[PDB]
Amino acid sequence: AGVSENAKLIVKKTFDSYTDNEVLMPKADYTFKVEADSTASGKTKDGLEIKPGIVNGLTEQIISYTNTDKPDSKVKSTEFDFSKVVFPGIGVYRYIVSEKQGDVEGITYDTKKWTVDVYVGNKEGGGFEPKFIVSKEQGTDVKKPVNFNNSFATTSLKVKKNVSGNTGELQKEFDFTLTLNESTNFKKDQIVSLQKGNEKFEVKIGTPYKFKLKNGESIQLDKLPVGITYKVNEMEANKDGYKTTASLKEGDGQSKMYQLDMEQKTDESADEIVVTNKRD
Ligand SMILES: [Ca+2]
User: Fold this and answer.
1) N- to C-terminal Cα distance for the chain?
2) Candidates 3.30.70.250, 2.140.10.10, 3.40.50.2300, 2.60.40.3050; CATH matching 6-153
3) Distance from the CA of 42 to the center of ligand 1, in angstroms?
4) Considering all CA atoms of the chain, what is the largest pairwise distance in Å, rounded to the nearest integer?
5) Ligand 1 ion: Cβ-proximal residues, 5 Å cutoff
6) What's the CA-to-centroid distance between 226 and ligand 1, angstroms?
7) Phi-psi group of 160: left, alpha or beta (phi > 0 → left; psi -120 to 50 → alpha; rest → beta)
8) Following DSSP, what letter does each residue of 68-123 receive, concatenated?
9) Taking the CA atoms of the chain, what radius of gyration do you get in angstroms?
10) How far is residue 187's CA from residue 179's CA, in Å, rounded to a whole number?
């Protein structure tokens, strides 16, 4: 554990808190870098010299995910080949391995780093090569394979109809449309679950979803991706005597006006839209 007997270091990527198949994995890339440990000095238990790692020969490496990946396919890997480095002699060459901070909305990128000790011996026929690679969490003495853990947030949207006024028709059915738009990280034809009462429905990103609400009724999407846009529209707004007003409330914040059919970007605050249809 944490000791590889070749010249390759395996680096894994995980999302420990991603367990719900209904949730969409963001289409995203994770970038890993190997740096010299410039503070490396001294000697090992058997007297071997500890030296800063040589990075010429190494490059940044990427692990990619798509919306098709699910909790069961969430662990991926890349391999850094230290045999591409020219070592000038016997020694322990010490590196630091890390994940770059990306820029995708909703994603938390692992900040932990790993100490990687490459034990270099004589190569048959001349010169030198890695014999063992030892990895540990930086600031620890525990041998452990290199693993970076990311997470991503989901959010929600609820849309409710209230019909008000003296002559508001308390069983009239208002037509609504919900459209989720594609983004860089969430693509067309991916599914998000919508709940109306005790029934579940599938909404496809990029296809307007038609539904109906009477007074008191709502739809909700509990596991919406972060960083997409949506539009909510009510087809008969301000018709048949009705004064229609729509509001948006985010988390425990203050309600503000929501313009029917206007794009709203999803972020880390839960959204609730109330459409009031008043008739005095
Ligand atoms: Ca929000």
Assistant:
1) 73
2) 2.60.40.3050
3) 53
4) 96
5) 250, 267, 269, 271
6) 9
7) beta
8) T--GGG--EEEEEEGGGS---SSEEEEEEEEE-----TTEE-----EEEEEEEEEP
9) 27
10) 13
CA of 266 to the centre of ligand 1 (A): 5
Give the integer Cα–Cα distance in Å for 76 and 241: 58
Residue 89 Cα to ligand 1 middle (Å): 57
Instruction: List, in sequence order, every residue forming a beta bridge with 8; answer none if it has no partner.
Output: 81
- The Å distance, Cα 14 to ligand 1 centre, comes to 27
**Alpha-carbon distance 57 to 73, whole Å?**
30
d(CA 209, CA 161): 16
Structure tokens at 231: 């539009």
Å from CA of 271 to ligand 1 middle:
5
Q: From the annotation, which residues make up the binding site for Ca(2+)?
A: 250, 267, 269, 271
Identify the CATH class of 154-280.
mainly beta
Ligand 1 geometric centre to CA of 249 (Å): 8
As to burial, measured by CB atoms within 10 angstroms (0-12 exposed, 13-18 middle, 19+ buried), residue 48 is middle
CA 270–ligand 1 middle distance (angstroms): 5
Resolution of the experimental model, in Å, one decimal: 1.8
Which tokens sit at 55?
A: 């990075």
257, 275, 261, 169: which is closest to 217 by C-alpha? 275
Every domain of the chain and the residues it spans:
6-153, 154-280
